[PDB]
Amino acid sequence: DAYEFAVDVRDFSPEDIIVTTSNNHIEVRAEKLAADGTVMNTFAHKSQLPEDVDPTSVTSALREDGSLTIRARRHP
């Protein structure tokens, strides 16, 4: 059975986005860098996947509305 949630990263481009998992912790992060390479705009969304979801199965996609979707499978 599928698990999915959406994160609003509409102010950022795909190349700006990072998805991290640590066990069942998931972080969607986005940054824009200035010319000097410092951070001009930063965003992070930290949440926890349900116990019955497999963290290794997480995939992400940028949806047409500009948000990012996290999809993952549950263990049966």
Residue numbers in the entry: 85 to 160
Please give sentences taken from the publication describing this entry.
Though it shares the common architecture of sHSPs (an α-crystallin domain, ACD, flanked by N- and C-terminal regions), HSPB7 is unusual as it has been observed to be oligomerisation incompetent. FLNC interacts with HSPB7, also known as cardiovascular heat-shock protein (cvHSP), via d2417–20. Our work therefore shows, structurally, how HSPB7 acts as a specific molecular chaperone that regulates FLNC dimerisation.
To investigate why none of the HSPB7 constructs dimerise to an appreciable extent, we turned to X-ray crystallography. We speculated that this might be due to a solvent-accessible cysteine (C131) leading to non-specific intermolecular interactions during crystallisation, and hence generated the C131S mutant of both constructs. Of these, HSPB7ACDC131S returned good crystals, which diffracted to 2.2 Å resolution; the structure was solved by molecular replacement in the P41212 space group. B The Ig-fold is very similar to that of other sHSP ACDs: it contains six β strands, with a groove between β4 and β8 and an extended “β6 + 7” strand. The monomers within the asymmetric unit contact each other through crystallographic interfaces between neighbouring anti-parallel β4 and β6 + 7 strands that form long chains of monomers in the crystal. The lack of a head-to-head dimer in the crystal form is different to most sHSP ACD structures that have been determined, but is consistent with our native MS data that showed monomers to be the dominant form in solution. A rationale for this might be that the β6 + 7 strand is shorter in HSPB7 compared to that found in the canonical human sHSPs; in particular it is missing charged amino acids at positions 118 and 129 that form inter-monomer salt bridges in HSPB1 and HSPB5. These differences likely act to reduce the strength of a putative anti-parallel interaction of two β6 + 7 strands (as per the canonical metazoan sHSP dimer), with the result that HSPB7 exists primarily as a monomer.
